Design a protein around this ligand. Sequence first.
Ligand SMILES: Cn1ccc(C(=O)NC[C@@H]2CCCO2)n1
Length: 284
Amino acid sequence: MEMEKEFEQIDKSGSWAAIYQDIRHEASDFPSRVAKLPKNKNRNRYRDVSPFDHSRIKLHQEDNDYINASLIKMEEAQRSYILTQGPLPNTVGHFWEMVWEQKSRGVVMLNRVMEKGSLKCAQYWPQKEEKEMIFEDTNLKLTLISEDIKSYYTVRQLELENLTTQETREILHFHYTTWPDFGVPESPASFLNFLFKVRESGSLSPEHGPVVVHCSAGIGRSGTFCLADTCLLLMDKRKDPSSVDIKKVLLEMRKFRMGLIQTADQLRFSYLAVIEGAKFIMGD
Ligand SMILES: Cn1ccc(C(=O)NC[C@@H]2CCCO2)n1
């Protein structure tokens, strides 16, 4: 079926939970043996969210190459993304090592450091220009260059220096700051505006390594971001945009990381975002 009318048909019939459970039943199951080794217990935030062995990002280190991160490679859309958990106190150096080694331009952050009164990820970037951060375990230095605070999101320019080689690179930090503590946003308008700002920066384009995207577990909000982006790109590329099937795209992405889209409310919000976004791309 088309999307917008499949949408109203699920709303009127109140069957979002049944649609979402079907997705969960059909989703791929692949091994994640490296994630479950005892030496990696303090590298995982949640015991039930792990990267598959076949698609995990490897650190360029011979001691321990493990990070909770996955490469999502979308062949028809010609986009790639790295989806990862929010960094932990003992993985902030690994996080920036990955950004460096994979040649990423942008980092997309969809959570606040504290939500619901608990810590959802480490404070992994510097908050003042004159107070830089050094990660001694991976030999990297990180400096805040500029910060632009808007009503729904903040963009930061950061400098990452590889202290072994003295090479430097500019990294863009796109921080969506207004996702509610419970539920999903009422309108997708600010989330779509944010996606378009990431796109306009070059961070999603083939001349750079894959964008790094995270929330707390790296599957819920993060899944919504890449699902909406890929669906809108396919609607631009194909002769028949109504052929894009958001449930099929989601199952394809779940071949590369488990659990993408965590609730039936997140699934409905993804439909809403793609539907509204497709009207803005053209004219109306
Ligand atoms: C981004 N884009 C390019 C073409 C289309 C498109 O025509 N989509 C058809 C409908 C409108 C809402 C749901 O899909 N969208």
